[PDB]
Design an enzyme around this catalytic site. Structure first.
Site, PDB file in Angstrom:
ATOM      1  N   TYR A  58       0.826  -1.203   0.000  1.00 42.79           N
ATOM      2  CA  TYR A  58       0.000   0.000   0.000  1.00 42.79           C
ATOM      3  C   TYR A  58       0.862   1.256   0.000  1.00 42.79           C
TER       4      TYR A  58
ATOM      5  N   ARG B 177       4.640  11.148  -8.932  1.00 43.34           N
ATOM      6  CA  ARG B 177       3.860  11.692 -10.036  1.00 43.34           C
ATOM      7  C   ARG B 177       2.973  12.849  -9.596  1.00 43.34           C
TER       8      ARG B 177
ATOM      9  N   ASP C 225       3.881  16.925 -11.333  1.00 42.81           N
ATOM     10  CA  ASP C 225       2.943  17.776 -12.047  1.00 42.81           C
ATOM     11  C   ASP C 225       2.516  18.983 -11.226  1.00 42.81           C
TER      12      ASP C 225
ATOM     13  N   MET D 169       2.880  23.450 -12.126  1.00 44.33           N
ATOM     14  CA  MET D 169       1.948  24.548 -11.893  1.00 44.33           C
ATOM     15  C   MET D 169       2.644  25.734 -11.239  1.00 44.33           C
TER      16      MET D 169
ATOM     17  N   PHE E 100      -4.342  19.940 -12.248  1.00 45.18           N
ATOM     18  CA  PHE E 100      -4.814  20.025 -10.867  1.00 45.18           C
ATOM     19  C   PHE E 100      -6.011  19.125 -10.604  1.00 45.18           C
TER      20      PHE E 100
ATOM     21  N   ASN F  26      -2.659  -1.121   8.061  1.00 44.49           N
ATOM     22  CA  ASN F  26      -2.599  -2.531   7.694  1.00 44.49           C
ATOM     23  C   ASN F  26      -1.416  -3.229   8.354  1.00 44.49           C
TER      24      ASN F  26
ATOM     25  N   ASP G   4      -3.658 -12.175  12.323  1.00 46.50           N
ATOM     26  CA  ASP G   4      -3.944 -11.659  10.991  1.00 46.50           C
ATOM     27  C   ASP G   4      -5.158 -10.742  11.099  1.00 46.50           C
TER      28      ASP G   4
ATOM     29  N   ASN H  78      -8.899  -8.289   2.414  1.00 41.41           N
ATOM     30  CA  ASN H  78      -7.834  -7.297   2.513  1.00 41.41           C
ATOM     31  C   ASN H  78      -6.940  -7.318   1.279  1.00 41.41           C
TER      32      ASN H  78
ATOM     33  N   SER I 286      -8.984  -5.659  -1.433  1.00 42.71           N
ATOM     34  CA  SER I 286      -9.081  -4.220  -1.208  1.00 42.71           C
ATOM     35  C   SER I 286      -7.830  -3.489  -1.676  1.00 42.71           C
TER      36      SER I 286
ATOM     37  N   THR J 179      -7.354  -0.600  -5.430  1.00 46.42           N
ATOM     38  CA  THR J 179      -6.623   0.661  -5.490  1.00 46.42           C
ATOM     39  C   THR J 179      -5.634   0.673  -6.651  1.00 46.42           C
TER      40      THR J 179
ATOM     41  N   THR K 227     -12.035   0.636  -1.161  1.00 43.56           N
ATOM     42  CA  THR K 227     -11.758   1.375   0.064  1.00 43.56           C
ATOM     43  C   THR K 227     -12.828   1.114   1.116  1.00 43.56           C
TER      44      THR K 227
ATOM     45  N   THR L 147     -12.139  -1.996   2.962  1.00 46.80           N
ATOM     46  CA  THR L 147     -11.069  -1.838   3.942  1.00 46.80           C
ATOM     47  C   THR L 147     -11.620  -1.386   5.288  1.00 46.80           C
TER      48      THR L 147
ATOM     49  N   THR M  46     -11.972  -6.343  12.891  1.00 41.30           N
ATOM     50  CA  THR M  46     -10.689  -6.797  13.421  1.00 41.30           C
ATOM     51  C   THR M  46     -10.405  -6.197  14.794  1.00 41.30           C
TER      52      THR M  46
ATOM     53  N   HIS N 177     -15.996  16.171   3.732  1.00 32.44           N
ATOM     54  CA  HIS N 177     -15.328  16.379   5.014  1.00 32.44           C
ATOM     55  C   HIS N 177     -15.165  15.086   5.822  1.00 32.44           C
TER      56      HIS N 177
ATOM     57  N   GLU O  15     -14.361  12.438   4.367  1.00 36.08           N
ATOM     58  CA  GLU O  15     -13.195  11.897   3.673  1.00 36.08           C
ATOM     59  C   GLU O  15     -11.894  12.390   4.296  1.00 36.08           C
TER      60      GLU O  15
ATOM     61  N   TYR P 219     -11.296  13.545   7.323  1.00 35.47           N
ATOM     62  CA  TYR P 219     -11.057  13.113   8.691  1.00 35.47           C
ATOM     63  C   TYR P 219     -10.648  11.649   8.770  1.00 35.47           C
TER      64      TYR P 219
ATOM     65  N   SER Q  39       0.624  10.005  18.690  1.00 32.42           N
ATOM     66  CA  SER Q  39       0.457   9.683  20.101  1.00 32.42           C
ATOM     67  C   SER Q  39       1.393   8.566  20.540  1.00 32.42           C
TER      68      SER Q  39
ATOM     69  N   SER R  90      -8.998  11.370  28.019  1.00 33.79           N
ATOM     70  CA  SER R  90      -9.299  12.577  27.259  1.00 33.79           C
ATOM     71  C   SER R  90      -8.992  12.403  25.777  1.00 33.79           C
TER      72      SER R  90
ATOM     73  N   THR S  86      -9.893  18.577  18.686  1.00 33.49           N
ATOM     74  CA  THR S  86      -8.565  18.639  18.088  1.00 33.49           C
ATOM     75  C   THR S  86      -7.587  19.363  19.007  1.00 33.49           C
TER      76      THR S  86
ATOM     77  N   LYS T 205      -6.315  17.103  21.834  1.00 32.64           N
ATOM     78  CA  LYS T 205      -5.272  16.177  21.404  1.00 32.64           C
ATOM     79  C   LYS T 205      -3.917  16.865  21.292  1.00 32.64           C
TER      80      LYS T 205
ATOM     81  N   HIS U  86      -4.569  26.741   3.133  1.00 35.56           N
ATOM     82  CA  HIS U  86      -5.150  26.191   4.355  1.00 35.56           C
ATOM     83  C   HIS U  86      -4.991  24.678   4.418  1.00 35.56           C
ATOM     84  N   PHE U  87      -5.355  23.975   3.349  1.00 33.49           N
ATOM     85  CA  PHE U  87      -5.332  22.524   3.414  1.00 33.49           C
ATOM     86  C   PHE U  87      -4.011  21.926   2.958  1.00 33.49           C
ATOM     87  N   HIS U  88      -3.112  22.725   2.394  1.00 38.01           N
ATOM     88  CA  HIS U  88      -1.735  22.277   2.272  1.00 38.01           C
ATOM     89  C   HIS U  88      -0.944  22.528   3.546  1.00 38.01           C
TER      90      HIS U  88
HETATM   91  C1  HEO Z   1      -7.214  16.437   6.351  1.00 37.14           C
HETATM   92  C2  HEO Z   1      -7.296  17.679   5.920  1.00 37.14           C
HETATM   93  C3  HEO Z   1      -8.117  18.705   6.609  1.00 37.14           C
HETATM   94  C4  HEO Z   1      -8.020  19.149   7.992  1.00 37.14           C
HETATM   95  C5  HEO Z   1      -7.103  18.706   9.101  1.00 37.14           C
HETATM   96  C6  HEO Z   1      -9.074  20.187   8.041  1.00 37.14           C
HETATM   97  C7  HEO Z   1      -9.293  20.849   9.292  1.00 37.14           C
HETATM   98  C8  HEO Z   1     -10.362  21.804   9.300  1.00 37.14           C
HETATM   99  N1  HEO Z   1     -11.122  22.107   8.056  1.00 37.14           N
HETATM  100 FE1  HEO Z   1     -10.130  22.422   6.319  1.00 37.14          FE
HETATM  101  N2  HEO Z   1      -9.906  20.482   6.849  1.00 37.14           N
HETATM  102  C9  HEO Z   1      -9.196  19.507   6.000  1.00 37.14           C
HETATM  103  C10 HEO Z   1      -9.544  19.278   4.634  1.00 37.14           C
HETATM  104  C11 HEO Z   1      -9.961  20.440   3.934  1.00 37.14           C
HETATM  105  N3  HEO Z   1     -10.715  21.516   4.604  1.00 37.14           N
HETATM  106  C12 HEO Z   1     -10.813  22.314   3.360  1.00 37.14           C
HETATM  107  C13 HEO Z   1     -11.490  23.576   3.337  1.00 37.14           C
HETATM  108  C14 HEO Z   1     -12.105  23.951   4.575  1.00 37.14           C
HETATM  109  C15 HEO Z   1     -12.989  25.141   4.595  1.00 37.14           C
HETATM  110  C16 HEO Z   1     -13.357  26.052   3.447  1.00 37.14           C
HETATM  111  C17 HEO Z   1     -12.699  27.418   3.463  1.00 37.14           C
HETATM  112  C18 HEO Z   1     -12.995  28.103   2.149  1.00 37.14           C
HETATM  113  O1  HEO Z   1     -13.469  27.423   1.212  1.00 37.14           O
HETATM  114  O2  HEO Z   1     -12.748  29.323   2.042  1.00 37.14           O
HETATM  115  C19 HEO Z   1     -13.447  25.192   5.979  1.00 37.14           C
HETATM  116  C20 HEO Z   1     -14.367  26.197   6.615  1.00 37.14           C
HETATM  117  C21 HEO Z   1     -12.772  24.040   6.624  1.00 37.14           C
HETATM  118  C22 HEO Z   1     -13.032  23.786   8.008  1.00 37.14           C
HETATM  119  C23 HEO Z   1     -11.990  23.102   8.714  1.00 37.14           C
HETATM  120  C24 HEO Z   1     -11.874  23.303  10.179  1.00 37.14           C
HETATM  121  C25 HEO Z   1     -12.672  24.218  11.066  1.00 37.14           C
HETATM  122  C26 HEO Z   1     -10.757  22.458  10.579  1.00 37.14           C
HETATM  123  C27 HEO Z   1     -10.269  22.292  11.976  1.00 37.14           C
HETATM  124  O3  HEO Z   1     -10.498  20.923  12.342  1.00 37.14           O
HETATM  125  C28 HEO Z   1      -8.823  22.633  12.322  1.00 37.14           C
HETATM  126  C29 HEO Z   1      -8.610  22.092  13.739  1.00 37.14           C
HETATM  127  C30 HEO Z   1      -7.233  22.367  14.297  1.00 37.14           C
HETATM  128  C31 HEO Z   1      -6.988  23.394  15.130  1.00 37.14           C
HETATM  129  C32 HEO Z   1      -8.081  24.332  15.551  1.00 37.14           C
HETATM  130  C33 HEO Z   1      -5.590  23.620  15.653  1.00 37.14           C
HETATM  131  C34 HEO Z   1      -5.303  22.701  16.838  1.00 37.14           C
HETATM  132  C35 HEO Z   1      -5.754  23.361  18.123  1.00 37.14           C
HETATM  133  C36 HEO Z   1      -4.937  24.058  18.933  1.00 37.14           C
HETATM  134  C37 HEO Z   1      -3.478  24.215  18.616  1.00 37.14           C
HETATM  135  C38 HEO Z   1      -5.465  24.695  20.203  1.00 37.14           C
HETATM  136  C39 HEO Z   1      -6.984  24.837  20.212  1.00 37.14           C
HETATM  137  C40 HEO Z   1      -7.400  26.101  19.493  1.00 37.14           C
HETATM  138  C41 HEO Z   1      -8.625  26.259  18.968  1.00 37.14           C
HETATM  139  C42 HEO Z   1      -9.660  25.177  19.080  1.00 37.14           C
HETATM  140  C43 HEO Z   1      -8.969  27.538  18.268  1.00 37.14           C
HETATM  141  N4  HEO Z   1     -11.949  23.130   5.801  1.00 37.14           N
HETATM  142  C44 HEO Z   1     -10.285  21.766   2.085  1.00 37.14           C
HETATM  143  C45 HEO Z   1     -10.312  22.392   0.712  1.00 37.14           C
HETATM  144  C46 HEO Z   1     -11.379  21.718  -0.136  1.00 37.14           C
HETATM  145  C47 HEO Z   1     -11.230  22.132  -1.579  1.00 37.14           C
HETATM  146  O4  HEO Z   1     -10.331  21.598  -2.262  1.00 37.14           O
HETATM  147  O5  HEO Z   1     -12.012  22.992  -2.038  1.00 37.14           O
HETATM  148  C48 HEO Z   1      -9.710  20.486   2.478  1.00 37.14           C
HETATM  149  C49 HEO Z   1      -9.003  19.459   1.630  1.00 37.14           C
HETATM  150  C1  HEM Z   2       5.098  19.866  -2.165  1.00 39.53           C
HETATM  151  C2  HEM Z   2       3.822  19.481  -2.265  1.00 39.53           C
HETATM  152  C3  HEM Z   2       2.679  20.177  -3.055  1.00 39.53           C
HETATM  153  C4  HEM Z   2       2.639  21.255  -3.869  1.00 39.53           C
HETATM  154  C5  HEM Z   2       3.759  22.220  -4.330  1.00 39.53           C
HETATM  155  C6  HEM Z   2       1.269  21.416  -4.311  1.00 39.53           C
HETATM  156  C7  HEM Z   2       0.806  22.398  -5.153  1.00 39.53           C
HETATM  157  C8  HEM Z   2      -0.512  22.607  -5.479  1.00 39.53           C
HETATM  158  C9  HEM Z   2      -1.006  23.609  -6.396  1.00 39.53           C
HETATM  159  C10 HEM Z   2      -0.120  24.614  -7.166  1.00 39.53           C
HETATM  160  C11 HEM Z   2      -2.338  23.500  -6.445  1.00 39.53           C
HETATM  161  C12 HEM Z   2      -3.314  24.345  -7.288  1.00 39.53           C
HETATM  162  C13 HEM Z   2      -3.598  25.686  -6.623  1.00 39.53           C
HETATM  163  C14 HEM Z   2      -4.475  26.488  -7.544  1.00 39.53           C
HETATM  164  O1  HEM Z   2      -5.221  25.867  -8.340  1.00 39.53           O
HETATM  165  O2  HEM Z   2      -4.416  27.742  -7.491  1.00 39.53           O
HETATM  166  C15 HEM Z   2      -2.732  22.421  -5.567  1.00 39.53           C
HETATM  167  C16 HEM Z   2      -4.022  21.995  -5.345  1.00 39.53           C
HETATM  168  C17 HEM Z   2      -4.391  20.858  -4.663  1.00 39.53           C
HETATM  169  N1  HEM Z   2      -3.546  20.042  -3.938  1.00 39.53           N
HETATM  170 FE1  HEM Z   2      -1.521  20.208  -3.856  1.00 39.53          FE
HETATM  171  N2  HEM Z   2       0.500  20.423  -3.746  1.00 39.53           N
HETATM  172  C18 HEM Z   2       1.335  19.651  -2.974  1.00 39.53           C
HETATM  173  C19 HEM Z   2       0.967  18.554  -2.238  1.00 39.53           C
HETATM  174  C20 HEM Z   2      -0.309  18.078  -2.065  1.00 39.53           C
HETATM  175  C21 HEM Z   2      -0.677  16.978  -1.210  1.00 39.53           C
HETATM  176  C22 HEM Z   2       0.295  16.151  -0.345  1.00 39.53           C
HETATM  177  C23 HEM Z   2      -1.992  16.796  -1.286  1.00 39.53           C
HETATM  178  C24 HEM Z   2      -2.692  15.673  -0.480  1.00 39.53           C
HETATM  179  C25 HEM Z   2      -3.998  15.397  -0.493  1.00 39.53           C
HETATM  180  C26 HEM Z   2      -2.523  17.788  -2.218  1.00 39.53           C
HETATM  181  C27 HEM Z   2      -3.830  17.987  -2.620  1.00 39.53           C
HETATM  182  C28 HEM Z   2      -4.299  19.013  -3.409  1.00 39.53           C
HETATM  183  C29 HEM Z   2      -5.671  19.203  -3.833  1.00 39.53           C
HETATM  184  C30 HEM Z   2      -6.864  18.294  -3.472  1.00 39.53           C
HETATM  185  C31 HEM Z   2      -5.725  20.306  -4.580  1.00 39.53           C
HETATM  186  C32 HEM Z   2      -6.989  20.894  -5.241  1.00 39.53           C
HETATM  187  C33 HEM Z   2      -7.023  20.499  -6.711  1.00 39.53           C
HETATM  188  C34 HEM Z   2      -8.156  21.203  -7.407  1.00 39.53           C
HETATM  189  O3  HEM Z   2      -8.746  22.137  -6.806  1.00 39.53           O
HETATM  190  O4  HEM Z   2      -8.467  20.835  -8.568  1.00 39.53           O
HETATM  191  N3  HEM Z   2      -1.458  18.549  -2.666  1.00 39.53           N
HETATM  192  N4  HEM Z   2      -1.592  21.899  -4.990  1.00 39.53           N
HETATM  193 CU    CU Z   3     -14.794  20.115   5.707  1.00 40.04          CU
END
Ligand code: HEO
Ligand code: HEM
Ligand code: CU
Ligand code: UQ8
Ligand code: 3PE
Ligand code: 3PE
Ligand code: 3PE
Ligand code: 3PE
Ligand code: 3PE
Lengths: 97, 184, 259, 659
Positions: free
Chosen positions: D61, D71, D75, D79, D103, D124, D135, D142, D145, D149, D201, D204, D211, D284, D286, D288, D299, D315, D359, D362, D419-421
């Protein structure tokens, strides 16, 4: 034994299907009571099919095989009612007001 | 041993119940999505659905008698109660095909009036599970007739017993939301 | 600090800048100590340090785990006084309490450009809007094609553009000038060229000259046959003015999908 | 031969694609040619490809995830090169037809074929070891599964060479991915890469749910479980309850493109907003799945290298359960700007901040785990320290984005992109590389190189803060996502820093290859003899390195938490049994690959409208399923001579090192 449990779940399922079918075909002079009785008898007939047919029990898999159904009912109620309420406000909006 | 696969299949049916609930949520949004086409009252013939409800209901008590015969030591009675519930399962498929064939020829297919798209995606998806359960029942009928009521064959009956009774629970939710509410 | 969100020019943008800054200050009371404890405990309590206390069996404390749960809850509770009073105040499709005759601008998304209709003036423009400063602007946004998003970043909020659906947005410009508006939702190969300009005139006298200029063009949009010619797929369209528009052209874009 | 294949779909007259087409083919033929030169085709069969062993499937895996990481990054660096070149007035390479396929493919590969197999592969390998299980509960399931992929990574790879990929983003939004705005095969490649991988998936999540609950060691209750198993249990619940939502939603898009139905169209009463409601109701839950075993990995690592017990077990367990429940009621935050009411956006805005509370519990529990311990600065420990700094910055960004008022100016901007990078590269990629280094002695028997492991860390964390922290500032100044050509010159000199930051992460992936090359070459020096290189606490370190393929001659009896640590504190910790018994083990099955071989033929036939091959491809999956039911030779007993020989060659290495 268990033969009477399947037969009691079979007789009650006939009664809980004809009566919802009979009110719609006749008319029953009230649309609100029809919708109440259809949705009430659908839930009860599901619960008949869980106990009498699927043999659901709390003491089945050391507390499991029942809480998994209760959890997924809450997930479905989150997904169905939540998306209906979201799409109702999205359809109440985006209109030529 | 044998109870692990039975519990593991029950978790899959819980995922399958969530799978059917997405189609119910999709259908409920597209109840009023008739683009000048027929509504629920112009299509649904409630005498025709009443026979389909009883055919799936007769196929659940019939499988219940097969599970009782599995707890006995009668090899031939398990096969005989499995042949009857296959006929009731085939009659449920044979009426959904005839209901779907009447709509497609008359111009009420899924490609027109996308309320009908959600109708074909919920009754048809439920009909695929009964069709998938009919092949599973036909495969299971040739293993009991050849090898007997072994330990592995007793688990596969109980896995299908969870599966076949689950499709009647979904059909309770299908004819309530679609047919009964739509044809008031 | 001068990048169109930290330096906005609209009342919605100014009230959203304070909403970002107040949320950012509330979250820094628990994120900054989380970062400092990640480095402070790593440096003070190394394996090479012998003066540090070593308690391998210490894993439970009621007076410590209570603070772990209470303070993120109290931040969220203070963020629950917000996010409800501000969502009900910064929401689109809600008119601003200004009372100075808001001007309605009808927005139609195309492939790949922006089509703007002025129903009260009878002027249609492409990739350019104008409105007087310190006046509310009513936006009715729809799409003739796939989903876009009407976005002027220096003026305030955004809203989606959908086919057969009428999204609403209220904006107001506090200072005169020109603001670059783009599409925020990806809509195909011509998505990078869907950029328009919003010219906020200093007064309504300079706005009426722009309306009188736009009705001197020989192009007209009096029927849906000329609308579908303009709705051809094209990229990087220039500014175009139409002197005469249909009186109910905005309803015809919605009704060609809903009927 | 039939369908829409007409030899013009091959991307000729395009030198960018044709180099990478020949790179895979000549790279693949060199890989095939090395196996037949060493005669290892009979070794890959019957030991690796058909193996139902969870350690063998756990490694493979990761190997799929590591290769797809190459790959999915190469790519993504195009960008950054394109957006730097497109600024300051230079329309260079990557036309918008070519750019929009990237993208979409970058999103699909990195979510489904990089992050998902790395999270599953760590579960796994470790989860059956920690609960005392020999096992997984369903060993044939398994293996099947895993190969579903591989069907997913085949269809995306042949989209580069045979046809084209989608041009709608990684979630295939409505009508732009419809049959009238995308008439190509690009969305069809997107549909069947997710349907065939998504049904594997889902199996899985069912496999690891039974298990953990049923195949545990005797004496181990649910609150005596390892914390990583608790995180893996709550993550597999999200797989079961959300991937059916993905299964329906892609299939509803399949009926629109093929049968011409009206679900998300704009003309015949379809609702395009229903897809975005459904694709984020899985979306969302997905993400988590990605972040919950990462919390379980960090941990275990922070408890191991601090020489201290994990602070707040009760806790941390209940925080993982609260994330699972609250993940299904927050999905409206991704489309706040659709046009919903004030009561809808504010309700989902509040509960999106509620899920940030468990969060934060933790995060602070690992800080007090290292409060009074002896912290050893291992390479895997550097990822844990770097995780808390990085995830807190991007986690603070998400709660800022959870406010709909702040979301109206930051939706679909580079502030969203950064934000999500911040929480996947900071969270998942750092989490998967931490568990890769931590369980490398258990997986292969030797330790990784410590010098190149730390060097690979510093390129990843410093190189992230150059690649994506300008994107935080770029999202403020109004730059939106997926912008290809004619970018504003005010966005220049901030995209150049972001493009320069991707070069440093490219060295971090390069240092990962050097770390694996040195460790394999020097595997005879840093050899894990006792099976426990660091101070282990969970039951996985009680076994040998590598495990003896049954993993336990006698299943252990668990009395308290950290059972292997309590065995060493009790004093004995290594007891040879007086007698052994035969071990019931499953056989390696050739099916699962044949079912996957008939699914990638069925998947390829549906894309190009080859209907006669689709019937043969679909019936091939069903007949092989039927023929894998009459096979009564699915299990065998390991003889006691094989068990006693493997245990005696392990207990003498324990006796050599004092114990
Ligand atoms: C696994 C990845 C992942 C993770 C960890 C998260 C974590 C969170 N997601 Fe980010 N989400 C993820 C995956 C995404 N969410 C996205 C976009 C996104 C957007 C849209 C924003 C926009 O479109 O403009 C919102 C509102 C959120 C909500 C959140 C929130 C509130 C958390 C929170 O859970 C964060 C929690 C962590 C915190 C808070 C820090 C730890 C806490 C500490 C240090 C002390 C405690 C402090 C406080 C509680 C304030 N997610 C997108 C973009 C989708 C797209 O491509 O369009 C993806 C991929
Ligand atoms: C060094 C590592 C990486 C770089 C430089 C990178 C770069 C980028 C760029 C340039 C974009 C497009 C932003 C735009 O369209 O304006 C993007 C989007 C995205 N990236 Fe990455 N990325 C990296 C790693 C990752 C990883 C590890 C994930 C894991 C899930 C990921 C998931 C995504 C997704 C889901 C999008 C949105 C695609 C879309 O909207 O069509 N990326 N990234
Ligand atoms: Cu979400
Ligand atoms: C169209 O947009 C584009 C992409 O998105 C699809 C690209 O991936 C790419 C390629 C991007 C990169 C430079 C990555 C180059 C590929 C690398 C590092 C090798 C990774 C691939 C493999 C080893 C996987 C092994 C192959 C298989 C499982 C399937 C092979 C099947 C066939 C055709 C026989 C381009 C150029 C592109 O323009
Ligand atoms: C049309 C598109 C979709 C097509 C879907 C495929 C349906 C085609 C027909 C498939 C069913 C044939 C099954 C034949 C019997 C073989 C399996 C068997 O004997 O069942 C026993 C098995 C328990 O396992 P065990 O006892 O160890 O034996 C291992 C068998 N490999 O028990 C099991 O757990 C295996 C049986 C599982 C039951 C299958 C579940 C049916 C779900 C079908 C969904 C169809 C619609 C999908 C909708 C998608 C979204 C729109
Ligand atoms: C057209 C493509 C179609 C799709 C293809 C997708 C394939 C996915 C699965 C590929 C992975 C297969 C397994 C990888 C090889 C692993 C070898 C290994 O770990 O060493 C085995 C052995 C060392 O001794 P042993 O003690 O058995 O090792 C550890 C025991 N736990 O060492 C030996 O004694 C033997 C020497 C090494 C064996 C040679 C194998 C070479 C590696 C094969 C290719 C790997 C990369 C494939 C990338 C695919 C990407 C999709
Ligand atoms: C994920 C579901 C999504 C819904 C749509 C598709 C439906 C098809 C998949 C449904 C089958 C799920 C069954 C899960 C049961 C799990 C528990 C169980 O009873 O498993 C028993 C058995 C595992 O056996 P094991 O114990 O490992 O060893 C014995 C080998 N004889 O398990 C088995 O041997 C049976 C399960 C393995 C065989 C399934 C592979 C067939 C998949 C065909 C897909 C068809 C549709 C493709 C098109 C996409 C959708 C349009
Ligand atoms: C958390 C769990 C751990 C993470 C999962 C693993 C992910 C990365 C996978 C790469 C490493 C897997 C294989 C490691 C095997 C180590 C070598 C070995 O065991 O020896 C095999 C062989 C010589 O065998 P011999 O020495 O006779 O037998 C004694 C065994 N101790 O030694 C040899 O000379 C042959 C070694 C073959 C190496 C296999 C590599 C193929 C797969 C590579 C994946 C992609 C790597 C990145 C790109 C590299 C580009 C060049
Ligand atoms: C999944 C399990 C089922 C898979 C097997 C389906 C095989 C269908 C073969 C039908 C052959 C045929 O005559 O199709 C007619 C029609 C198109 O007619 P044709 O003249 O080939 O036009 C070319 C391009 N449309 O074909 C069509 O209009 C499309 C027929 C296929 C329908 C797609 C299946 C949807 C499955 C979605 C998930 C369930």
């Amino acid at each position: 034994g268990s033969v009477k449990t399947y037969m009691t779940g079979f007789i009650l399922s006939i009664i809980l299907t004809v009566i919802p079918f009979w009110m719609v075909m006749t008319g029953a002079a009230s649309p609100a009571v029809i919708l109440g009785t259809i949705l009430a008898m659908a839930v009860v007939q599901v619960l008949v099919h869980l106990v009498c047919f699927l043999h659901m029990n709390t003491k089945s898999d050391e507390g499991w095989n029942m809480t998994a159904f209760v959890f997924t009912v809450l997930i479905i109620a989150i997904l169905v009612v939540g998306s209906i309420w979201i799409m109702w406000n999205l359809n109440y909006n985006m209109m030529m007001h | 041993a044998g109870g692990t696969k039975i519990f593991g299949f029950w978790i899959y049916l819980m995922s399958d119940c969530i799978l059917f609930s997405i189609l119910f949520a999709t259908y409920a949004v597209l109840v009023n999505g008739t683009a000048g086409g027929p509504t629920g009252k112009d299509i649904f013939e409630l005498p025709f659905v009443l026979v389909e409800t009883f055919l799936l209901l007769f196929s659940s008590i019939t499988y219940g008698m097969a599970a009782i015969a599995m707890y006995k030591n009668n090899k031939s009675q398990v096969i005989s109660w499995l042949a009857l519930t296959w006929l009731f399962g085939a009659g449920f498929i044979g009426m959904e095909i005839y209901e779907f064939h009447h709509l497609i020829v008359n111009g009420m297919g899924p490609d027109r009036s996308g309320f009908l798209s959600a109708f074909f995606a919920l009754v048809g998806t439920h009909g695929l599970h009964v069709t998938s359960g009919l092949i599973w029942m036909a495969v299971l009928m040739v293993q009991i007739a050849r090898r007997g009521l072994t330990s592995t064959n007793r688990t596969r009956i109980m896995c299908l017993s969870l599966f076949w009774h689950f499709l009647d629970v979904v059909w309770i939710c299908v004819f309530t939301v679609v047919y009964l509410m739509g044809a008031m | 600090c001068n990048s169109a969100l930290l330096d906005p020019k609209g009342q919605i943008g100014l009230e959203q800048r304070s909403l970002i800054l107040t949320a950012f200050g509330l979250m820094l009371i628990v994120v900054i100590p989380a970062i400092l404890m990640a480095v402070g405990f790593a440096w003070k309590y190394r394996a090479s340090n012998k003066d540090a206390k070593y308690s391998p069996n210490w894993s439970h404390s009621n007076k410590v785990e209570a603070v772990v749960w209470t303070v993120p809850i109290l931040i969220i509770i203070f963020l629950a006084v917000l996010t409800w009073k501000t969502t009900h105040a910064l929401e689109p499709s809600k008119p601003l309490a200004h009372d100075e005759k808001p001007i309605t601008i009808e927005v139609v998304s195309m492939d790949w450009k922006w089509f703007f209709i002025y129903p009260e003036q009878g002027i249609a423009t492409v990739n350019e809007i104008a409105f007087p400063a310190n006046t509310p602007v009513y936006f009715k946004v729809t799409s003739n094609s796939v989903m876009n998003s009407f976005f002027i970043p220096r003026l305030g909020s955004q809203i989606y553009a959908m086919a057969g659906m009428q999204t609403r947005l209220h904006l107001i410009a506090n200072e005169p000038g020109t603001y670059d508006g783009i599409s925020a939702s990806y809509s195909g190969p011509g998505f990078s060229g869907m950029k328009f300009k919003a010219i906020a005139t200093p007064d309504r006298a300079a706005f009426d000259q722009w309306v009188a200029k736009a009705k001197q063009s020989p192009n007209t949009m009096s029927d849906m046959a000329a609308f579908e010619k303009l709705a051809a797929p094209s990229e990087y369209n220039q500014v175009e003015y139409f002197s005469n528009v249909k009186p109910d052209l905005f309803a015809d874009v919605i009704n060609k999908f809903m009927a | 031969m039939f369908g829409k294949l007409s030899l013009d779909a091959v991307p000729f007259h395009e030198p960018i694609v044709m180099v990478t087409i020949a790179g895979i083919i000549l790279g693949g033929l060199a890989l095939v040619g090395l196996i037949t030169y060493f005669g290892k085709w009979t070794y890959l069969w019957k030991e690796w490809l058909t193996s139902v062993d969870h350690k063998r499937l756990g490694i493979m895996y990761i190997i799929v995830a590591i290769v797809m990481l190459l790959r999915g990054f190469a790519d993504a660096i195009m960008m950054r090169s394109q957006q730097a070149l497109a600024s300051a007035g230079e329309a260079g390479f990557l036309p918008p037809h070519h750019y929009d396929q990237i993208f979409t493919a970058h999103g699909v590969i990195m979510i489904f074929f990089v992050a998902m197999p790395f999270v599953i592969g760590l579960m796994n390998l470790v989860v059956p070891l920690q609960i005392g299980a020999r096992d997984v509960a369903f060993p044939f399931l398994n293996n099947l599964s895993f190969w579903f992929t591989v069907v997913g990574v085949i269809l995306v790879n042949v989209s580069l060479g045979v046809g084209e990929f989608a041009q709608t983003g990684w979630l295939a939004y409505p009508p732009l991915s419809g049959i009238e705005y995308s008439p190509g095969v690009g969305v069809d490649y997107w549909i069947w890469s997710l349907q065939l991988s998504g049904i594997g998936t889902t199996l899985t999540g069912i496999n690891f749910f039974v298990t953990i609950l049923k195949m545990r060691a005797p004496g181990m209750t649910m609150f005596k479980m390892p914390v990583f198993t608790w995180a893996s249990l709550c993550a597999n619940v999200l797989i079961i309850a959300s991937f059916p939502i993905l299964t329906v939603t892609v299939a509803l898009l399949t009926l629109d493109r093929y049968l011409g139905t009206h679900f998300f169209t704009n003309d015949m009463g379809g609702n395009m907003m229903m897809y975005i409601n459904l694709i984020w109701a899985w979306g969302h839950p997905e993400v988590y799945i990605l972040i919950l075993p990462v919390f379980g990995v960090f941990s275990e690592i922070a408890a191991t290298f601090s020489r201290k017990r994990l602070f707040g077990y009760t806790s941390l367990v209940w925080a993982t359960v609260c994330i699972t429940v609250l993940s299904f009621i927050v999905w409206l935050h991704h489309f706040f700007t659709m046009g919903a009411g004030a009561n809808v956006n504010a309700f989902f805005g509040i509960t999106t901040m509620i899920i940030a509370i468990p969060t934060g519990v933790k995060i602070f529990n690992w800080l007090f785990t290292m409060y009074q311990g002896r912290i050893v600065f291992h390479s895997a420990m550097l990822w844990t320290i770097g995780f808390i700094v990085t995830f807190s910055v991007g986690g603070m960004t998400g709660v800022l984005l959870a406010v709909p008022g702040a979301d109206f100016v930051l939706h679909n901007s580079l502030f969203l992109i950064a934000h999500f990078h911040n929480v996947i590269i900071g969270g998942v990629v750092f989490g998967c590389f931490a568990g890769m280094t931590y369980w490398w002695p258990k997986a292969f028997g030797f330790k990784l190189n410590e010098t190149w492991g730390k060097r690979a860390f510093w390129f990843w964390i410093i190189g992230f803060f150059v690649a994506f922290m300008p994107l935080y500032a770029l999202g403020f100044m109004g730059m939106t996502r997926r912008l290809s050509q004619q970018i504003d010159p005010q966005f220049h000199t901030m995209l150049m820093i972001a493009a320069s930051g991707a070069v440093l992460i490219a060295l971090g992936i390069l240092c990962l290859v050097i770390q694996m090359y040195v460790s394999i070459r020097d595997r005879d020096q840093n050899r894990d003899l006792t099976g426990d290189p660091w101070g282990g606490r969970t039951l996985e370190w009680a076994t040998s390195s590598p495990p003896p393929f049954y993993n336990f001659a006698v299943v252990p009896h668990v009395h308290e938490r950290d059972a292997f640590w309590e065995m060493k504190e009790k004093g004995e910790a290594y007891k040879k049994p007086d007698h052994y018994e035969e071990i019931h083990m499953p056989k390696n099955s050739g099916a699962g690959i044949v079912i996957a071989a008939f699914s990638t033929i069925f998947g390829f036939a549906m894309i190009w409208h080859i209907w006669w091959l689709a019937i043969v491809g679909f019936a091939g999956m069903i007949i092989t399923w039927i023929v894998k039911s009459f096979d009564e030779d699915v299990d065998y007993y390991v003889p006691v001579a094989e068990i006693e020989k493997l245990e005696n060659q392990h207990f003498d290495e324990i006796t050599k090192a004092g114990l």
